[PDB]
Design a protein around this ligand. Structure first.
Ligand SMILES: Nc1ncnc2c1ncn2[C@@H]1O[C@H](COP(=O)(O)OP(=O)(O)OC[C@H]2O[C@H](O)[C@H](O)[C@@H]2O)[C@@H](O)[C@H]1O
Ligand SMILES: Cc1cc(F)c(Br)cc1NS(=O)(=O)c1ccc(NS(=O)(=O)c2cc(Cl)cc(Cl)c2)cc1C(=O)O
Ligand SMILES: CCCCCCCCCCCCCCCC=S
Ligand SMILES: [Zn+2]
Lengths: 8, 296
């Protein structure tokens, strides 16, 4: 569970 | 563009920043430094993003005419060429060669263009963290299928084809559901591929990012683990990137040019591309070339 996002 | 079935709830990040260009004097000075840094360093990991496929006519996401940049200001994106017809760039090919002579330990890519694999780059030294338009994968047994043409879905949807693997005992077809490998916003990264990239980047002592704005994680933070463990960090990108502050060396130039100069400073030929050559396993290493010359 390491999701592709920008974090915020 | 996400009429292709994908999430409209995505943070597109910071789009459309203006492109910086280093003046040609400072560029040559910098690329020389990189070349010394490559040769001087034992384990070297490269991190690619959309910026290295722009030369082939595939747009970036967050550039001046990026996909998200244009969507964000109410406009149709502009595709020059298809994924099938797109041809590997000097950078794609330079990277191929850099692996052959052991100057590249591992390659980490955010690109779904399929062009690293089609460049001939060995798959077992490549993490394709956001997927590959041409690769589909069996849900039941995890087996992958590199195709000649795109699998025709994104967002980890089913492509409407079944797995042809015949199993060890019995040897009858698996018939699992084949799905694309394209991650959607907030989809989990691939376990194997992220693990290898994570390890590669921890134990790397030089990380070089090429043509990524470094805004999407975890992909864009792997180059930092290199530094936290005492390594160096080179950032080749036209726009500024999210981690510019941590770079030991920023280069603001065209990536095809930088690599073109880099391969001369290392005294290496950049191959031409015959056409699509899926190479599952890396060949035996070629011998490491002559020592680089110093600056004239
Ligand atoms: N020839 C060039 N030389 C150097 N840089 C270039 C060139 N052409 C463009 N650029 C720069 O290259 C940079 C490209 O940055 P971005 O567009 O954010 O692409 P990513 O791969 O980092 O995006 C990651 C994910 O986000 C998406 O959702 C997908 O899932 C992606 O996989 C820009 O700063 C350009 O100025
Ligand atoms: C040659 C081909 C055969 C197919 F079966 C299919 Br599907 C597509 C292609 N063309 S492709 O090059 O590989 C190709 C692959 C993917 C995308 N997706 S995209 O850019 O996000 C996009 C999505 C949506 Cl919903 C509308 C548009 Cl206008 C664009 C586009 C193309 C293309 O450039 O047309
Ligand atoms: C790798 C370069 C591709 C640039 C051309 C644009 C192709 C469309 C890609 C859409 C793929 C979906 C991306 C969503 C990823 C989660 S934010
Ligand atoms: Zn299967």
């Amino acid at each position: 569970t390491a999701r592709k996002s920008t974090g915020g | 563009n996400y009429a292709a079935g994908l999430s409209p709830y995505a943070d597109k990040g910071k789009c459309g920043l203006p492109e910086i260009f280093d003046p040609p004097e400072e560029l040559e000075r910098k690329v020389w430094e990189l070349a010394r840094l490559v040769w001087q360093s034992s384990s070297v990991v490269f991190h690619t993003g959309a910026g290295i496929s722009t030369a082939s006519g595939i747009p970036d996401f967050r550039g001046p005419h990026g996909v998200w940049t244009m969507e964000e200001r109410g406009l149709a994106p502009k595709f020059d060429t298809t994924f099938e017809s797109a041809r590997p760039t000097q950078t794609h090919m330079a990277l191929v060669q850099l692996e052959r002579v052991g100057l590249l330990r591992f390659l980490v890519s955010q690109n779904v263009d399929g062009l690293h694999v089609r460049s001939g780059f060995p798959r077992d030294k490549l993490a394709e963290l956001h997927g590959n338009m041409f690769v589909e994968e069996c849900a039941k047994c995890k087996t992958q299928y590199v195709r000649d043409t795109v699998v025709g879905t994104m967002g980890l949807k089913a492509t409407g084809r079944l797995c042809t693997v015949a199993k060890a005992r019995g040897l009858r077809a698996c018939r699992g559901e084949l799905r694309d490998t394209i991650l959607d916003w907030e989809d989990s990264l691939p376990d194997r591929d992220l693990a290898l990239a994570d390890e590669a980047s921890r134990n790397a002592d030089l990380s070089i990012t090429l043509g990524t704005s470094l805004q999407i994680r975890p992909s864009g933070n792997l180059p930092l683990a290199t530094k936290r463990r005492g390594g160096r960090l080179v950032i080749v990108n036209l726009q500024p990137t999210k981690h510019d502050r941590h770079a030991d060396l920023r280069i603001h130039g065209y990536v095809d040019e930088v690599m073109t100069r880099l391969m001369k400073h290392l005294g290496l030929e950049i191959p031409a591309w015959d056409g699509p050559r899926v190479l599952e396993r890396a060949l035996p290493p070629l011998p490491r070339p002559p020592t680089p010359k110093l600056e004239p």
